[PDB]
Design a protein around this ligand. Sequence first.
Ligand SMILES: CCCCCCCCCCCCCCCCCC(=O)OC[C@H](COP(=O)([O-])OCC(O)COP(=O)([O-])OC[C@@H](COC(=O)CCCCCCCCCCCCCCCCC)OC(=O)CCCCCCCCCCCCCCCCC)OC(=O)CCCCCCCCCCCCCCCCC
Ligand SMILES: CCCCCCCC/C=C\CCCCCCCC(=O)OC[C@H](COP(=O)(O)OCCN)OC(=O)CCCCCCC/C=C/CCCCCCCC
Lengths: 54, 68
Amino acid sequence: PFHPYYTIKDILGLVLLLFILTTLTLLSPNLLNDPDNYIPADPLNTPPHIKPEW
Amino acid sequence: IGRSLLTYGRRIPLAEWESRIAEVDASVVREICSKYIYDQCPAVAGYGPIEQLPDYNRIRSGMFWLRF
Ligand SMILES: CCCCCCCCCCCCCCCCCC(=O)OC[C@H](COP(=O)([O-])OCC(O)COP(=O)([O-])OC[C@@H](COC(=O)CCCCCCCCCCCCCCCCC)OC(=O)CCCCCCCCCCCCCCCCC)OC(=O)CCCCCCCCCCCCCCCCC
Ligand SMILES: CCCCCCCC/C=C\CCCCCCCC(=O)OC[C@H](COP(=O)(O)OCCN)OC(=O)CCCCCCC/C=C/CCCCCCCC
């Protein structure tokens, strides 16, 4: 049966995901960040180096 | 007679049994049932088409109430 086995197993998985998410949010927030999106939009100039989200 | 002299060392007369029965009351039942049944691990045996016999964890969790 799904309960109790996979209930606790998925809860463990969620705890792990939250640990990773917190470390990414507080300890190293700029790891995946892109500087070129901290410049507001300019319809007359495309920047030389273009790169979407990963 | 035989079984009694082996187990008890003595014959227990019906009068003594009656006196012992008269002392039980709902409070005694509550107490002693709690003393032997409540939140205990059981022994289980099954024979037959027993696919639907609950899992052991599900049976163990049935030995206590969350609302108590
Ligand atoms: C989000 C992310 C999602 C993705 C995540 C991904 C990963 C997920 C992985 C995990 C997945 C898990 C899946 C679920 C597994 C479920 C397993 C299961 O059901 O097992 C069945 C399990 C197996 O037993 P069984 O074989 O079925 O045998 C049945 C027997 O009857 C057994 O009899 P028993 O006596 O042993 O147990 C019966 C009793 C056992 O429980 C109890 O007696 C109490 C348990 C502990 C205390 C909890 C009290 C909560 C009270 C409500 C909230 C108020 C708190 C105080 C604050 C007041 C504020 C004014 O439980 C009940 O009767 C059920 C209800 C218990 C609560 C009573 C209140 C009901 C109304 C709820 C809504 C209230 C809204 C308004 C609130 C006020 C205004 C804000 O038995 C159950 O019945 C389990 C009960 C589980 C109850 C869970 C309650 C959760 C909700 C709480 C309230 C939420 C709202 C809060 C609002 C804000 C105010 C605080
Ligand atoms: C917000 C970030 C939090 C980060 C930290 C980690 C979060 C995740 C942690 C795990 C959360 C688990 C939630 C789901 C409930 C899991 C229950 C569990 O594993 O135990 C099973 C067990 C079922 O009992 P059995 O033994 O199987 O049956 C007995 C039958 N006689 O669950 C229970 O205890 C059910 C009874 C209810 C327990 C309490 C449920 C949660 C709510 C309680 C607090 C109420 C106030 C909530 C307020 C929230 C804010 C407004």
